[model samples]
Target: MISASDLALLTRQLATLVAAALPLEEALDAVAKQSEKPKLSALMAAVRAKVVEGHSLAEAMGNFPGSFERLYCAMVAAGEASGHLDAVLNRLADYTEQRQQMRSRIQ
Candidate 1:
């Protein structure tokens, strides 16, 4: 399972790239390469590949339930449907960061 902090980082980078008008596939590749952790890197790469295969971002992300929750996928789907993925990603980034902070405090 991926940690909340890592998820936050991924969301933040993806948000920035998407907002900048980067192609989603290339953005996923870029984010995948930015990770030092092999697991996260591989996961991102797989997701990217799925997207390249014509899967929606939410569907691709849904394949990794351990990393992306149901609510996360639903939100992504909503964003994609509404053409506001960048905004949703930024919100997700904030949420993941907050979750990480809460976990830190609990520990």
Candidate 2:
């Protein structure tokens, strides 16, 4: 299972790559290659495979509920629909980081 911080980092990286006009498949592959953890890398590869099979990023992500929450997937869907997925990813990174910070404070 991916941690909140890992998700935040991945989102931030993806946002930057997408904003640079990289194709989603290439970006996902690049990120998957960059991951240090075998499990996370495999997870990203699996998501990319789904995308390659014609699923939207949000839909592929939805299949991995432990990694992507319903709210996160919904926001991704909205972003894809609006053609502003990069912006949404950046916002999601911020939201995830903030939520992690709040959780830490409560602990």
Candidate 3:
């Protein structure tokens, strides 16, 4: 399982990459390499695989239920609708990190 902190960090970094104009599949593959946790790494691996198979990003991410929630999937859907997946990812980065910060303080 991916810790909230790791999830937050991963999302932030991946968002940064996506915002940088890297292709989605390329970004996912790169992030998969950067992850330290086997599970998160595995999660990234699966995402990359799905993308390679031509699945939508939201669906690929949906493969990880524990790491991603309904709201997240919905936001991705909305982003897809708005032609703003990159911007949505940036916002998701913000939200995940903010949640992780609160989680840290609670620990």
Candidate 4:
């Protein structure tokens, strides 16, 4: 399972790629490669495989419940449906960042 801090970082980097207009799979490839954790890397690889087989990012994410929460999948699904995944990803990035910052203060 992904840690909260790692998930926050991953979400931000993924948002950066999405904002850069890269295809989702290409972005995921970069995310997978950039991950230092073996589990995250392996998880991304699995998700990428699903995407290659004609699945949406949400679908790929759905296959890994230990990594992706229902709210995360739902948001991604909505973003895909609305044709504004980049924007949605950016929002998620912001949320993750703020959450991390808050936790940093709490600790």
Candidate 5:
């Protein structure tokens, strides 16, 4: 299972790539190439394949319930619907960072 910290890192990396104006598939590819974790790279490649097969990011994300929450999926769907995925990812990255900070403090 991917840890929450890894999830935050992934989302932040993806958000950075998306904001760089790369196509989603290319962004995924780039992120996959950069990943030290083999499973994470594979997961990114799988998501990219689904995207190449014409699935929306949200729909492709649904295939990995272990990696994404319902709120994450819904937010992605909303982002897709509104053509604001970059912004959505930015918000997600911020939220994840904050959660990580809070969790560390509580521990």
Candidate 6:
């Protein structure tokens, strides 16, 4: 079981990796390979599996709805429509980190 903090950190790190221009799977692979949280790591591996089985990243990511928000899905949809998925993912990651920062300040 992964703590919420672990998942948040994972998501934030994923955003940074994505911003670095790593392919989706490459970023997921790096996270799965390095994450200390077993459950979060498993989530990344499962996401890759979904991709290998021919799902769009957004669709596969939607499977973990508990971790993703409606805004995230909407943004990914927009990215898909715009053909700028990587750029969108970077924005998602950045948004997530900014939110987390605010959360830290609040707490």
Query: Order of candidates by TM-score, top first?
Result: 1, 3, 5, 2, 4, 6
Highest TM-score model number = 1
Deviation from native of the Cα of residue 50 in model 5, angstroms: 0.7
> Which whole-number lDDT from 0 to 100 does residue 28 have in model 6?
82
Clashes found in each candidate (C-alpha, N, C closer than 3 A) = 0, 0, 0, 0, 0, 0
Off by over 4 Å in 4: none
Question: How well is each residue in 1-103 modelled by candidate 5, as lDDT tens digits?
Answer: 5677778888899999999999999998998999999999999999889999999999988889898778988898999999999999989988777766776
TM-scores vs. true structure, each candidate: 0.96, 0.92, 0.93, 0.90, 0.92, 0.78
Better of 1 and 4 by TM-score: 1
Summarize candidate 1's per-residue lDDT along 2-24 as a digit string, tens digits. 89888988888888899899999
Mind giving the per-residue lDDT tens digits that candidate 3 earns over 1-107? 46778888888888889888899888998898898877777888898898789888888888887888879878887887888988898899899989888988989
lDDT (10s digit) by residue, model 4, range 13-43: 8999989999988999999999998888888
Residue 98 shift from truth in candidate 6, angstroms: 1.6
Q: State the displacement of the C-alpha of residue 76, model 6, in Å, after optimal TM-score superposition.
A: 1.8
lDDT of 4 at 82: 100
Off by over 4 Å in 3: none
Which lDDT tens digits does candidate 6 get at residues 3-97?
Answer: 44565676667777877888878888998888876777888899878877888777877888777667787787788779787678777767776
What lDDT is reached at residue 21 by model 2?
91
- Winner by lDDT between candidate 5 and candidate 4: 5
Local distance difference test scores for all models: 0.92, 0.89, 0.85, 0.88, 0.88, 0.75
After superposing all C-alphas onto the true structure, candidate 4 shows an RMSD in angstroms of 1.4
- Candidate 4 Cα deviation (angstroms), residue 45: 1.3
Model 2, runs deviating above 4 Å: 103-107
Instruction: Write down the lDDT that model 2 would get.
Output: 0.89
Alpha-carbon deviation at 57 in model 6, angstroms: 0.7
Per-residue lDDT of model 2, residues 1-107, tens digit only: 56877887788777778888999999998889998888888988999999999999999999999999999999999999999999998899789888777767877
